[PDB]
Amino acid sequence: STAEWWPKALNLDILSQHDRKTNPMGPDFNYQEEVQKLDAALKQDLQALMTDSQDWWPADWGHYGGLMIRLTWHAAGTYRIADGRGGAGTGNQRFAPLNSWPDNTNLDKARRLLWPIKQKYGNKLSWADLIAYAGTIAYESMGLKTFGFAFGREDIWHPEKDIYWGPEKEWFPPSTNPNSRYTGDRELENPLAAVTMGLIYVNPEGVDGNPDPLKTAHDVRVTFARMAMNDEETVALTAGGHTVGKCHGNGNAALLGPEPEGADVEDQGLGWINKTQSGIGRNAVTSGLEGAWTPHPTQWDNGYFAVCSLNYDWELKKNPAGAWQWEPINPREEDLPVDVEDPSIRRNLVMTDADMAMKMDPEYRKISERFYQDPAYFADVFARAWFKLTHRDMGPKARYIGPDVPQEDLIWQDPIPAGNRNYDVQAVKDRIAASGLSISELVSTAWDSARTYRNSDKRGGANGARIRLAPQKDWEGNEPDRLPKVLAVLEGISAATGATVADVIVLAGNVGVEQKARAAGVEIVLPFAPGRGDATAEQTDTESFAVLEPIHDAIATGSSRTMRQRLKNCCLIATQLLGLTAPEMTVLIGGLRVLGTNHGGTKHVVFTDREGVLTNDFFVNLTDMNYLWKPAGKNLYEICDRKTNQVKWTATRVDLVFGSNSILRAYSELYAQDDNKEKFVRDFVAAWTKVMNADRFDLD
Amino acid sequence: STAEWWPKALNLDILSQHDRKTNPMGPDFNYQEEVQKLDAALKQDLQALMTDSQDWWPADWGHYGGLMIRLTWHAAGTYRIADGRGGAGTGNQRFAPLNSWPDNTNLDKARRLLWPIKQKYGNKLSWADLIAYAGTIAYESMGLKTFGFAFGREDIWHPEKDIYWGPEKEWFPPSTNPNSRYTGDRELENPLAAVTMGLIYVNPEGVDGNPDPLKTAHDVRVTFARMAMNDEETVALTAGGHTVGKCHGNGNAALLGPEPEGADVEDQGLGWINKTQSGIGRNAVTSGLEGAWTPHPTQWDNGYFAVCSLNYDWELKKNPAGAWQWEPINPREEDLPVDVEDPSIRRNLVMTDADMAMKMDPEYRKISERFYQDPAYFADVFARAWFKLTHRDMGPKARYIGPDVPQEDLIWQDPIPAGNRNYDVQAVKDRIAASGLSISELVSTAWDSARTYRNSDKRGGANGARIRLAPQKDWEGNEPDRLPKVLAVLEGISAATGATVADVIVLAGNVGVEQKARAAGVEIVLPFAPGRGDATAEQTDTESFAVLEPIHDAIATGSSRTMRQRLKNCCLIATQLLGLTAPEMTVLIGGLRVLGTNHGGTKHVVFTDREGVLTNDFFVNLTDMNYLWKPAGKNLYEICDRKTNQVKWTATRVDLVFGSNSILRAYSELYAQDDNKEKFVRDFVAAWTKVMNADRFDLD
């Protein structure tokens, strides 16, 4: 197509996803308000589905719970803390490439089995919520006291183009190959939270397919941590997950047809279909391993650790489909799981390399032991972890809807109280104006408070005013000395008024922008919404926030250190997380530059003889051919006058890409037109507002 | 990215281009009304630019006309009749990949030279119009009486993803290579109108770089015909084009930097920049050939045929950059073009292989002779052809705006008169209802009248009611016997009322749809706009309309013959030309199917026990897993009941792709929800309306 030609080019399309032309819903359609009308006592239908076997994909022992829990687990298992991408918050498993990953084999059947319910509840039940709820109801039906559930996940209509899944151009390849995601000594390429392409967290047969429970344990600890789970939550999840259901590998795999995206139309959007021989029931082949972890896989119990992983000794075996798996030595007949179609036949137990790791790894072993001797703890830790798994990308509790939302404020939700809304905004502004804070100090501070937001998992943002807290107040990119000079003033204004520090930091930014538009002879009142609360250090997980540190921010031409990634690459990624379009990214850069907001007070792209005045000067000058651009070191250029051959300004790649990239320059040219001065200001303001209000889910 | 994984998948993204998130203009912005306010006497600024040389890319002999004419010519030269794609109607040359094609080398300089003007006139002058106007004003300034010009081309903001430019994964490769666009004996892959990738029409040095004017003449005739130009227009264009300007090839090419999309940010979005040595002025290297076709290249004259191509004899030479070119034998000094920087130095004349073809090809030679002995004719034929070149993708004259629009109605515009608007719509409807025409006969006829439309060059559509004319009335896909049974009735209703046959065919379709919604117990009045005119056979070019023949239409599950292209591929291409989104394509297919509109009255995807009733039955049944799909021959499937193993319905790939493609099935599922019956009807209607009104540029 139009570009395999220049693969180094910015993938600007990630900024224009989920737009009008792909969305089939009317423009006033609002899911939050339609799901609030849902008859959640739909729990009866979902629970009934569990024992409502369909011929084209029969339920094991007449119960789909194991399958449904795996569905939800896999929908959730794609999340990663580095950027908050992946997760069950958008129902992405119904689209490429996730619907066709090897690890999601046969989950297409699970999703399809949920369709009658989606058809019944319609627009009030998104595929995203349904897929995320399925496993929870399954657990309920099988005996587990779940912790809770919240609806509120809006559906998407095409693949999430912004997610980089890994460097491999092959499915589940060895870690000792070209295009490997591994470096040094088994050091996982940073963003990634899986050991290979097409897998959720870890290889069930062992690292690169070679069984050792100790090396497998290392991958499990690493990948789960990258998904926000610690040792306890991990052992809990693994055991709790395998307490029900089984592994399917009773047949030749090579006989499975193409994964969904590669199957032809006769397959109804399904995949991995066996047409050579029976591929359903006891003849089902999924992961390739075969057997169940517990005697009673249709029910919550203590069978996982209870004579199985801890009380029997295990040895390596090969299943019918050629996969490595662990089986018990001399198991008693009563402990053998029965056949999925005929209860009078006995089959075998199993443990994957990840299950054996729970017994062999010294640290997991201690936790395994606690859950073995204290099942009440196990069930509580698992239930909570199951809930965290399914909501870790839901964002603020304000987004949670439904009768079963837990009253408890969990730390991973980034709890923030409602701030006072009755306080007279204008008095707050006058006191801000009346302080000796520069237009520049006002804007940078507000920018920094809001820039932490990312729509991937909805964490960050200006609401709870955390920047004032550790570790944020000390982040290099946040300019710690200038930040307190400003917090000191603003904290005083808030105590003196009834407005929150969070509301004040934003309102101050708004003042800086208002002062700058006024200096260019433009009068404007920037929209504003009170209500931000101030969050406490107690409800702020210092370790989980490390991931939101601004190590890079092109919007303030700041780069903490030399990075592999191009500066505009970094710019593009922050703007995608922020939820901004290319036109929005463009005006923002042009505006912030003339407001004199660079980190370190650098003039890298000021291009104005009048900083502090909101003009379209950045574009007018960037687009002026009377100048030539001379590379001048690392991420730096000299903007020279062609006549005098003298250096007029300096600039970085973040600045110049807006005058190099054909699409961005087209935007730059527009804003540099003689007739678009007011449009630039109006558009800068709207984008500014969008950023300050991005995390405002507390609003209606 | 998200899919090199399944390259056979529908490129649905081509249906969601140019959306809100990429458009930087407010949503109420309307170019047609802003350009109507333009001070077209901007002709003075454009004309002044011609002699306003800029240091970073100096004008040859102090005149940019040759360069500007080439700019416009190349912007226009990308058009092709097979699908109407390409052309100067969107200003696509400012974006990838066209901005970086080898043939467009240094046109980046031309575009950049026009920026001060675009900056001055702003939102009232699109880049598309400016680029298309540049060459016309250049010709005016150099002495040619141009035929006219119309503004009205709206700007785009990213590459036109829908255009397939060719199969090559390399630039300008030989025709005797893998991935070649040539088959049998030099038979150009059909859609394409160029001999290789990255070139506009033909190779200037000869077929695959080997000079012979006779084989070159064959490519010129073939490519220009694919661009709607006959022998006369072609000789005219070639000679008229080369009557001014020159070829640039005075240097080592290998020294040129990367084309624009491959250049780094310091190049200001420009490309082919020489940093090793001087690459401007007389040292400029573009095509690689060097010399001018006429003694006086800054002026319109009769020098092209006048002692140059006809009166001097020519021989093969090699220019400084190693390109083949023809030079004259023993030219007199006065006929030598002077140096571009210093008038006191003489340089050389040249003729490309395409110019020599005008002298050597027997047929071109006769036309060349007429233009040599009758320059008034030459100038008139060229002027008209220059105008056709720059407007052949503008569509109906209704779209033309400006003081210089020619009063003459040119045949290639598909002229259609204004039809009467005062006639009482309801009386027309009652008479239609009162006829014995089936709901099916009404809908299919209207569909067929409107389906010919394509937004690529804005030709086709229900307005002028041509379907009633040759060759349309006899096209197989239009079902000639059923079409006249319906025209006979409808032609009578129109004569009896004051409404046009065109308005009547559409209104009839609207009645069929209204009758079908009524049968499903839904009352609706479909929007309607009177005014369509009936076009005459005299103003209808039977040969130019061949290209709009519906050889395929998935919307009515019709395929004239087995084709290389997948049926859904064909479906996707018609819907892109029609201007429809994926959600729109989806409801349309579902609706037309239950209305019983298949070509040949086939039941391939009816899936209703009630044809003629507008229900969401197609989706409800397509999405029902109680059925399995069994391939059953060419483009056919048997929809079988899983319990009884009996054939319930049949269907084609066009039907089943909506239940296979993950994105389309998501749409299908939505419309199959219990709560979306009315949404389906409302959405089907809106899409129906959009199609019936697509060519209505005559409306405000």
Ligand code: HEM
């Ligand atoms: C700790 C890393 C894990 C590994 C290596 C792993 C591996 C596997 C494998 C190979 C299967 C085979 C399924 C088939 O062939 O059909 C399976 C099934 C399953 N896993 Fe895991 N798993 C892990 C974690 C979890 C977690 C954390 C849970 C959820 C809390 C879970 C829940 C399930 C369920 C419910 C099934 C049953 C599928 C069915 O019965 O159809 N797994 N797992």
Ligand code: HEM
């Ligand atoms: C008939 C097929 C044609 C071929 C093979 C051809 C080839 C070329 C080539 C190789 C150049 C070299 C320019 C450079 O190196 O800078 C050129 C220049 C030019 N051509 Fe054509 N051309 C064709 C048709 C036309 C037509 C139909 C027109 C417009 C009616 C046209 C107008 C021009 C102009 C104005 C230039 C001058 C560029 C300048 O002075 O900077 N050409 N052409």
